[PDB]
Amino acid sequence: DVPSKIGTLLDLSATELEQVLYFSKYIVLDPKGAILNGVPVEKRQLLTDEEYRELRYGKQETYPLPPGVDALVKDGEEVVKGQELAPGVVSRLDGVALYRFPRRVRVEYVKKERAGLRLPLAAWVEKEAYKPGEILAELPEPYLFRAEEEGVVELKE
Amino acid sequence: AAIDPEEEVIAEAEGVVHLHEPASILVVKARVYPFEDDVEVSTGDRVAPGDVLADGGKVKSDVYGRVEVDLVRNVVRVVESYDIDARMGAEAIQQLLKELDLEALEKELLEEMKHPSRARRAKARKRLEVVRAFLDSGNRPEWMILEAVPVLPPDLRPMVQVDGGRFATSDLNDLYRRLINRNNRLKKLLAQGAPEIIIRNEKRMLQEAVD
Amino acid sequence: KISTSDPVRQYLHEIGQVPLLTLEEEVELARKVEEGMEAIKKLSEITGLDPDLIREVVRAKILGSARVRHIPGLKETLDPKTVEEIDQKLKSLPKEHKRYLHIAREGEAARQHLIEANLRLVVSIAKKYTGRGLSFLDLIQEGNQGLIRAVEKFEYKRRFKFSTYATWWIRQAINRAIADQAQEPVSLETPIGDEKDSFYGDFIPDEHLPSPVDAATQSLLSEELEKALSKLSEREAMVLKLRKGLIDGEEVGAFFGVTRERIRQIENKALRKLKYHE
C-alpha cells in the first residue's frame, strides 16, 4: 500500500528491501552475526545468496582435471591466492588444497637386503652421515682386489 | 574397499601410500588441526575457540568457523562461519517487529525530525505518523504479520447445485484450498526432512497464496 | 520478482555447483547415508534411544538450528535445551562409539547435499505434467516430496543408479497428489447474458434449506439392507455387495473362481429368495 506501512515503520529501504526478501530467499541479520566479509556484524542489513552461502558454507571450490594430469595433490595441505594446480588449472580462491576423488595410487613395498664389498683400508671412506645418494669411497687409483667366491652370473637392474 | 568382495585392494607387505590422480581439487579456506590420540567433537558444529577441540585438550582452534571431521588423516578443518542469524521471509520480520521500542523510536524520530536540516525530515515526519498511530489508541505492530488466518464463514462463500451435474463455487474457496494445500505440504515437508531451497520454495508459494 | 524463474536459478545454481559425478560423488553420498542409518541403529542400541529420534537429533544438529520436532509415534520434545543434552551424551561415548556419531553426521548432511543435487531431475520430470490440473510449482513440490521419498528407500548396494530409481518415486508423488488435488464446477462470478455487470449468483433463486430424506433415509437404508444382506449366504450377498458397492461397476471377473454360470445362477436365485421368502 502506497506508504509501505511496514517498510516505512521498520528502518527500511521503504520499498525494495521488503519486496526483495519477503518473496525471495534474501536475508537481513537477525541479532548477532559475528563473522567477516569486508565489514563486521551488519545488525540490520541485507545480502544475496552468494555472500550468504559464502557465510553458511564458507568458500569451497571445484577444480576439474582431464583424465591424466595431476601436479600437486600431495600439497593436500596448502594453497595461495592464484596458485598453479596443474597445466591449465589455476585457483584464485585462497585456502587449502584438498584431495578430492582419486584414481592412481602408489604402493612402495620397500624390499630390504644385505650385501658385501671391499674398500681402501687406510682411506677414510665410511661415514654414518651418509644415506642414499651419498658418497661411499673416493679416489683410489685403482681397485681390483680379491672378491673371494665364485658361481653363476646374476645381475639386477 | 569396493562393491564386490571379488578383488578389492587387500594390503600386501608394508607400503608407503601415495596418490597421483584426483578427479577434482577442493580449495576450501580452512584451518588444518591434526589429532593423533583420542577423539573429538564431530563435523558441523560452531567454534571460536570453543572448549574442547581435539585429543581431549591438547588442540584448540582459534579462528571462527564450522567443524569438519576427517576420518582418514585424523584432522579437522574449520571453515569460515559462525551462528550468523540470517533470516528470509516473514518470520524474520515478525522478529523485527517484536524487537522494537516505539517509545525509543519516537524520541529518535523527534530528533531525526527537527535537528537535521530541510529536504530530509519530510520522510521522518511521514514515518513519525505511523509510529504515533501505533502508540496512540493503536495496537502492537507484531500482529501486522499473520500466523493465524481467519476463515470466512461458508455461506458467505457458498457452494451449490445449478443445472444438474454442474456445481457453482464462490471464487474464495479455491483460494482457501490453494492455501490449505500449500500449508499442509509445508508441514509434511518439515516432517519428511528439510533441504533448505525446497522449503523456501514452499514458504514462498505460501506467501504467494495468502497474498 | 516473478517466481517463474527464481526457484529455477535457485535450483540450477546449486545443481550448477553440484551436478553429481555420475558415479563418484553420486554413490559417495549414498554410502554415507547408509553409514548414518546403521551408525544410528547401533547408537539406538548403545543409548537405548529411538532410531528416528537419534535420526532427528542429528538432523537438527546439521541444519544449524530448527524448530523441527515431528516424528512417528510422538510429535514433540523440548528442542534447544534437550538436543544438546543428547549431544553431550554423544560426547561421553568413547572413541569406539563416538565414531558412529561422526559418521552418521556426515551421512545425513550428505543426504541433504544429495537431494539438493538431484532436484533438476524433479524439474524435468514435472515438466511433462504441465496442463494436468496443478500448478507447476505445486507439481514440482510434490515431485520433491517424491524424491525425498526415494532417498529414504534407496539401496546403493544394487548397482543401478539414483537418477532412474528416483524417477519412479517422483512420478508416484506427482500422480498421487494429482488424483486428489486437481466438466468441472464453474465459478460463481461470470458476466451472464449481455456481458455488462451480471454475476451468475444474481440469477439463481433459493429452493429448500433442510434438504431432508438424507440422514434418516440412509439410517433406515443401510441397516435394513444389511439385515437382509446378512440373512443370506455371505458368498452370494457379498459378491455384488462389493462388486456393485465398494469399488467399481463385472461378471466376467465376478467370481473369485467359479463358472460364469454359477455367479449368474446364485446371483439371481439369491435376489429371488431375498425379495420374497417362501
Candidates A13, A18, A30: best to mutate against B (most CBs of B within 10 A) is A30
3-state secondary structure of B170: coil
The structure was resolved to a resolution in Å of 3.6
Q: Say if the Cβ atoms of C13 and A49 lie within 8 Å.
A: yes
Question: CA–CA separation, C100 vs B43, rounded Å?
Answer: 12
Partner residue opposite A107 with nearest CB, options B12, B97, B127? B12
In the sheet with B24-28, reading across from the earlier edge strand, the strands are: A62-64, B24-28, A96-99
Please, are residues C102 and B74 in contact by the beta-carbon 8 Å criterion? no
Please, are residues B193 and C59 in contact by the beta-carbon 8 Å criterion? yes
Min Cα distance C7 → chain A (Å) is: 9
Q: What b/e sequence results for B149-168 when a residue is b if at least 16 CB atoms lie within 10 Å of its CB, and e otherwise?
A: eeeeeeeebeeeeeeeeeeb
| Contact residues on chain C for B191, CB-CB shorter than 8 A | 70
Q: With residue C73 as reference, give the H or E element that holds it.
A: none
Question: CA–CA separation, A73 vs B25, rounded Å?
Answer: 8
Min Cα distance A31 → chain B (Å) is: 6
Grid look-up 510422538 returns C74
Total length of chain A? 157
| Contact residues on chain C for B83, CB-CB shorter than 8 A | 64-65
Interface of B with C in 16-75 (CB under 8 A): 23, 38-39, 41-45, 69, 71
Residue A117 is placed in which grid cell? Answer: 664389498
Q: What b/e sequence results for C187-224 when a residue is b if at least 16 CB atoms lie within 10 Å of its CB, and e otherwise?
A: ebeeeeeeeeeeebeeeeeeeeeeeeeeeeeeeeeeee
Residue C144 is placed in which grid cell? Answer: 520433491
Chain A residue with Cα closest to B101: A10
Q: With residue A126 as reference, give the H or E element that holds it.
A: none
CATH topology of domain C212-278: Arc Repressor Mutant, subunit A (1.10.10)
In this complex, the chains that touch B, judged by 3 or more CB pairs closer than 8 A, are A, C
Please, are residues C121 and C167 in contact by the beta-carbon 8 Å criterion? yes
The β-bridge partners of B59 are: B54
Candidates B36, B43, B73, B172: best to mutate against C (most CBs of C within 10 A) is B43
Please, are residues A97 and A72 in contact by the beta-carbon 8 Å criterion? yes
Min Cα distance A125 → chain B (Å) is: 32
Q: Tell me the technique behind this structure.
A: X-ray
Centre a 10 Å sphere on the Cβ of residue A81 and count the other Cβ atoms it contains. 10
Best CA proximity match to A96, nearest among B65, B62, B74, B28 = B28
Q: With residue C66 as reference, give the H or E element that holds it.
A: none
Please, are residues A33 and B86 in contact by the beta-carbon 8 Å criterion? yes
Please, are residues B105 and B131 in contact by the beta-carbon 8 Å criterion? yes
Tell me the H-state helices in B20-75: none
Please, are residues B194 and C63 in contact by the beta-carbon 8 Å criterion? yes
CA A3 to chain centre: 54
Q: Say if the Cβ atoms of C109 and B208 lie within 8 Å.
A: no
Best CA proximity match to C40, nearest among C95, C107, C96 = C107
CA angle B194, B195, B200 (to 5 degrees): 95
Candidates C20, C23, C24: best to mutate against A (most CBs of A within 10 A) is C24
Domain residue spans of chain C: 1-182, 212-278
Please, are residues C36 and C105 in contact by the beta-carbon 8 Å criterion? yes
Main-chain phi, psi angles of C179, to 5 degrees: -60, -40
| Contact residues on chain C for A25, CB-CB shorter than 8 A | 10
DSSP readout, B96-162?
Answer: HHHS--HHHHHHHHHHHHHSS-TTTTHHHHHHHHHHHHHHSS---GGGGS-SS-PPPPSTTS-EEE-
Q: Is the dihedral of CA C218, C224, C228, C230 positive or negative?
A: positive
Question: CA–CA separation, A89 vs A84, rounded Å?
Answer: 6
Q: Say if the Cβ atoms of C3 and A49 lie within 8 Å.
A: no
Q: With residue C18 as reference, give the H or E element that holds it.
A: none
Question: CA–CA separation, B44 vs C106, rounded Å?
Answer: 9
Please, are residues C182 and C142 in contact by the beta-carbon 8 Å criterion? no
Residue C146 is placed in which grid cell? Answer: 517424491
Any A CB within 8 A of B85 CB: yes
Question: CA–CA separation, C101 vs C88, rounded Å?
Answer: 11
Min Cα distance B85 → chain A (Å) is: 5
Please, are residues B76 and B69 in contact by the beta-carbon 8 Å criterion? yes
Chain A residue with Cα closest to B81: A55
Q: Which residues contact B178 (CB under 8 A, 6 or more apart)?
A: B209
In this complex, the chains that touch A, judged by 3 or more CB pairs closer than 8 A, are B, C
Residue B181 is placed in which grid cell? Answer: 494445500
Residue B116 is placed in which grid cell? Answer: 537535521
Residue numbers in the known binding site of C are: 76, 92, 194, 197
Strand-strand pairing, A96-99 and B159-161 = unpaired
CB pairs under 8 A between A and B: 210
Q: Which residues contact A23 (CB under 8 A, 6 or more apart)?
A: B204, B207, B208, C1, C3
CA angle C172, C178, C183 (to 5 degrees): 150
Strand-strand pairing, B167-169 and C186-187 = parallel
Chain B residue with Cα closest to C122: B198
Q: Is the dihedral of CA B152, B154, B160, B165 positive or negative?
A: positive
Question: CA–CA separation, C86 vs C43, rounded Å?
Answer: 11
Grid look-up 556484524 returns A41
Chain A residue with Cα closest to B143: A6
Burial class (CB in 10 A: 0-12, 13-18, 19+), C171: middle
Q: Is it true that domain C1-182 has CATH number 1.20.120.1810?
A: yes
Any C CB within 8 A of A25 CB: yes
Q: What is the DSSP letter of B65?
A: E
Centre a 10 Å sphere on the Cβ of residue A145 and count the other Cβ atoms it contains. 9
Residue C18 is placed in which grid cell? Answer: 553440484
3-state secondary structure of B17: strand
Question: CA–CA separation, B127 vs B133, rounded Å?
Answer: 10
Q: Which residues contact A31 (CB under 8 A, 6 or more apart)?
A: A43, B85
Please, are residues A48 and A26 in contact by the beta-carbon 8 Å criterion? yes
Q: What is the DSSP letter of C57?
A: H
Candidates A35, A72, A79, A104: best to mutate against B (most CBs of B within 10 A) is A35
